From a paper:
Our results supported a “two-arm” architecture of the STRIPAK complex, with the PP2Aa/c-bound STRNs acting as an organizing center to hold Hippo or other MST kinases with STRIP1 as one arm and SIKE1-SLMAP as the other. Moreover, we determined the crystal structures of the second coiled-coil domain of SIKE1 alone, and in complex with an STRN3 peptide, as well as the structure of the first coiled-coil domain of SIKE1 in complex with the first coiled-coil domain of SLMAP. SIKE1 functions to bridge SLMAP through CC1 on one hand and STRN3 through CC2 on the other.
To further dissect at atomic level the SIKE1-SLMAP assembly, we determined the crystal structure of SIKE1 CC1 (residues 5–65) in complex with SLMAP CC1 (residues 167–226) at 2.3 Å resolution. An SIKE1 CC1 homodimer was interlaced with an SLMAP CC1 homodimer to assemble as a parallel four-helical bundle. A group of hydrophobic residues including I5, I8, A12, L15, L19, A26, L29, L36, V40, and M43 from SIKE1 CC1, and L168, L172, A175, L182, L186, L189, and L193 from SLMAP CC1 packed together to form a hydrophobic core. Moreover, residues D11, D23, Q32, and R39 from SIKE1 CC1 contacted residues Q173, R178, K185, Q190, S200, and D201 from SLMAP CC1 through hydrogen bonds and salt bridges. Taken together, these results revealed a 2:2 heterotetrameric assembly of SIKE1-SLMAP and identified the leucine residues on the complex interface, namely L15, L19, and L36 of SIKE1 and L182, L186, L189, and L193 of SLMAP essential for SIKE1-SLMAP assembly. A further mapping experiment identified residues 5–65 of SIKE1 and residues 167–226 of SLMAP as the minimal regions mediating the interactions between the two proteins with a Kd of 6.9 μM. Meanwhile, SIKE1 CC1 can form a 2:2 hetrotetramer with SLMAP CC1. More importantly, SLMAP associated with STRN3 only in the presence of SIKE1. Together, these results indicated that SLMAP is recruited to STRN3 via SIKE1.
Numbering used by the authors:
A (entry chain A), C (entry chain A): 2 to 48
B (entry chain B), D (entry chain B): 163 to 208
C-alpha cells in the first residue's frame, strides 16, 4: 500500500527502458555510419 | 506532498521516455528506407 | 540534510533532460527525413 | 535501505541518459555530414 513500492518499481522500470533505448541509439549510430559510408562512396565513384 | 510530486515526476519521465523511444523507432525506419533507396543509384555506379 | 532533497532535484533534472533530448530526437527525425528526400530525389533523377 | 537504492537508480538513470544524449549528438553530426556529402552528387544531376 505504501508509496515507494510503486515509485521504486517506476524508477527501476525507467532505468531499464533507458538502458535498452541507449542500446537502440547505439545501433542507430552504426545505421547512420553505414549510410554515411554509402553516400560517400557514391560521391567518390562519381568523381 | 513530496511523495505525490515524486510519483508525478517519475510517471511523467516514463511517459516522456516512451515519446523519445517512438522517435528513435521512427529514426530507425527512416534510416533503413534511406539505405535501400540508395541501392539502385549505387548499383548504377557498380 | 534529508534524502529527498537530492532525490527530488535528481528526478526533476532527469525529467528536464528527457524533455530537451526528446526534442533533440524530434529534430533528428526531420534531419533524417530531409536526407531521405535527398537520396530519393537523386535516385529518381537517375531513373 | 530503499532511500539509498533510489538514490542509486536515479543517479544511474541520469548517467545512462547522458550516455544516450552523447549518442544522439553523434547521430546529429553523422546525419549532417552525410547530408553535405550528397551535395556534389546531387548537383551533378542538377
Amino acid at each position: 500500500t505504501m508509496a515507494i513500492e510503486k515509485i521504486l518499481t517506476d524508477a527501476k522500470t525507467l532505468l531499464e527502458r533507458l538502458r535498452e533505448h541507449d542500446a537502440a541509439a547505439e545501433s542507430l549510430v552504426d545505421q547512420s555510419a553505414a549510410l554515411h559510408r554509402r553516400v560517400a562512396a557514391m560521391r567518390e565513384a562519381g568523381t | 506532498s513530496t511523495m505525490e510530486q515524486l510519483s508525478q515526476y517519475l510517471q511523467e519521465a516514463l511517459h516522456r521516455e516512451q515519446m523519445l523511444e517512438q522517435k528513435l523507432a521512427t529514426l530507425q525506419r527512416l534510416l533503413a528506407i534511406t539505405q535501400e533507396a540508395s541501392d539502385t543509384s549505387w548499383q548504377a555506379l557498380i
